[PDB]
Design a protein around this ligand. Sequence first.
Ligand SMILES: Cc1c(-c2cc3cc(Nc4cc5n(n4)CC(=O)N(C(C)C)CC5)ncc3c(N)c2F)cnc2c1NCCO2
Length: 264
Amino acid sequence: RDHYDLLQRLGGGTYGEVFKARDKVSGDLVALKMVKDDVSTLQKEILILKTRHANIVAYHGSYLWLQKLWICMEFCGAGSLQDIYQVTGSLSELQISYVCREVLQGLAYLHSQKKIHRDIKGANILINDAGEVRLADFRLEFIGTPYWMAPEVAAVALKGGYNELCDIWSLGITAIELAELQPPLFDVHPLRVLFLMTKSGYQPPRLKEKGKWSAAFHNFIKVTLTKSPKKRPSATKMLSHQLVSQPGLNRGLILDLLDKLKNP
Ligand SMILES: Cc1c(-c2cc3cc(Nc4cc5n(n4)CC(=O)N(C(C)C)CC5)ncc3c(N)c2F)cnc2c1NCCO2
């Protein structure tokens, strides 16, 4: 409050209470997230956030003022991939490929720290001005969006049991999302989507157009969208997949996309 100047509410309830702020001593842009009772318990949860990955939005500081918690993070100028594709349209196969590798690297770190993101979706993958892909590491708000749920997460509403492998399924849905501007079954009732997953003969989703994509992209979708969690590969195993281990994958693919965002 006394060090930063608030400028713009970001998310519109999607993120919660996020603010685009400017430092009075640096002038640099930051993201301030306000979280809705004890003093000693609050200072313990912050210390663990400073100990930091290339594909994770970096922590800056925390502020406990008048019953409000101010989580400070880095500002990704372009916003989320969803904000980007609402202007640029669908991403190229190589753009999606690079985005998947970067998300998979962030998930490898998160899952190694015994954490589960649980919300991997287009609107939760941020792209900074530098063309870098970053995820966010954080009675409470139920985390999860029906269309991006793994079958073991949807079924959890009857016969519980899920693990870090759900983020692999969510990344699979997000790959289809970045290609078709909508997840599979976006047009179908969320209970019906999460009900058809719980029935026999269930077929995991694929890209609508077969001819528009390569067999490696089609295999990445087949492999990440494995119905069985036991057979679904780990984030590190996925990193060696033909699609995300291609040689042309560089940050420039996103500097191209960010240029289309500026002037299409
Ligand atoms: C990802 C996340 C965050 C989170 C968000 C951030 C956003 C940014 N920058 C930007 C830049 C923009 N937008 N956002 C979106 C946006 O509204 N517009 C508007 C102006 C149309 C376009 C330009 N920068 C940093 C962020 C950061 N660190 C965060 F943690 C907080 N809470 C969460 C989640 N996940 C789901 C629920 O909880």
